Amino acid sequence: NTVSLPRSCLSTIESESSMANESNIGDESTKKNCGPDPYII
Amino acid sequence: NTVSLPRSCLSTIESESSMANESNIGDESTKKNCGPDPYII
Amino acid sequence: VYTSGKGSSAAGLTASVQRDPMTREFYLEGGAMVLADGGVVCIDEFDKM
Amino acid sequence: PRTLTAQHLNKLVSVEGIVTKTSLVRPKLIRSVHYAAKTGRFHYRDYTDATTTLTTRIPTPAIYPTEDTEGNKLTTEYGYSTFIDHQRITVQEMPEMAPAGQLPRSIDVILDDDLVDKTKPGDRVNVVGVFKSLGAGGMNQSNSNTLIGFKTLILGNTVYPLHARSTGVAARQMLTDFDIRNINKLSKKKDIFDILSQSLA
């Protein structure tokens, strides 16, 4: 009201919840990386 | 018989078929990028 | 619309059909006779056309 | 097409105009079927894209399979696969309604399967569908360019040809039993030719 969609997922910097910290890791040692330009409209 | 899993998807360099060229693009202008370390065992 | 026979400079006297420069399709290019629909058309030198 | 704006997006509309150009009717691959010689088994895969559903979905770009899960080669079975017809058309503002001296406006309509060849260029048509946007208007990645916007079109579901004067679409009227009775009755009189003649103009 040049806006662009975020380059990275915003669920890491945004510490939404305590269980959100759990949800951002799983299946042993592998880190969570959504990728480049993960958002859709 | 240090081997590592491929860093990139191998479906592009491997020109498997003529329809495989079609399958590697879709939904308008967006390019196809599988991401880093896309393979699982 | 006030015009003569043979129309005006770069303006015809009757409906003209032309193709769109970019889309390459039909539209009414002009023409005093349709431009003045619902009004009056003033023709001078009616004997030359 | 002139009075269709960005405030009608995602809503069901009905547009009128003139067909200007159609497209070649092409098949679209939906399900492929294959065969393995070393095992004697048949496999298959499904494919989808963004225009086959009204709601947005997460893409699943599956590849065309040439091998088996065990490395064996595959053979395509063109007779057992599935293809669907596809066409794209353009609709413009009617010549008898557009303002004089002004360049016209038009909109694209996409049709599928059983509505694929229901009109020809030059017809007066009425199309009812959903006015929808697609993709990202240069938002993903940097895409410094700002001139382009969001691609938009109509996912049609109803196409109606309309009859006009001095056009190639013929008029037809549905005949009811009352009409048939009255016609077959009037057929039995003796001055029928005279009555029908005196009615003209």
Swiss-Prot record, chains A, B:
Function noted in UniProt: Acts as a component of the MCM2-7 complex (MCM complex) which is the putative replicative helicase essential for 'once per cell cycle' DNA replication initiation and elongation in eukaryotic cells. The active ATPase sites in the MCM2-7 ring are formed through the interaction surfaces of two neighboring subunits such that a critical structure of a conserved arginine finger motif is provided in trans relative to the ATP-binding site of the Walker A box of the adjacent subunit.
Family designation: Belongs to the MCM family.
Entry superkingdom: Eukaryota
Localization annotation: Nucleus
Additional note from the record: Present with 10300 molecules/cell in log phase SD medium. Early fractionation of eukaryotic MCM proteins yielded a variety of dimeric, trimeric and tetrameric complexes with unclear biological significance. The MCM2-7 hexamer is the proposed physiological active complex.
Record-given protein name: Minichromosome maintenance protein 5
Quaternary organization: Component of the MCM2-7 complex. The complex forms a toroidal hexameric ring with the proposed subunit order MCM2-MCM6-MCM4-MCM7-MCM3-MCM5; loaded onto DNA, forms a head-head double hexamer. Interacts with CSM1.
Curated annotation (Swiss-Prot), chain D:
Annotated compartments: Nucleus
Domain of life (superkingdom): Eukaryota
More about this protein: Present with 35100 molecules/cell in log phase SD medium.
Protein purpose: Acts as a component of the MCM2-7 complex (MCM complex) which is the putative replicative helicase essential for 'once per cell cycle' DNA replication initiation and elongation in eukaryotic cells. The active ATPase sites in the MCM2-7 ring are formed through the interaction surfaces of two neighboring subunits such that a critical structure of a conserved arginine finger motif is provided in trans relative to the ATP-binding site of the Walker A box of the adjacent subunit. The six ATPase active sites, however, are likely to contribute differentially to the complex helicase activity.
Subunit structure and binding partners: Component of the MCM2-7 complex. The complex forms a toroidal hexameric ring with the proposed subunit order MCM2-MCM6-MCM4-MCM7-MCM3-MCM5; loaded onto DNA, forms a head-head double hexamer. Interacts with CSM1.
Family statement: Belongs to the MCM family.
Protein name (database record): DNA replication licensing factor MCM3
Organism: Saccharomyces cerevisiae (strain ATCC 204508 / S288c) (Baker's yeast)
Residue span relative to the full protein: 168 to 368 of 971
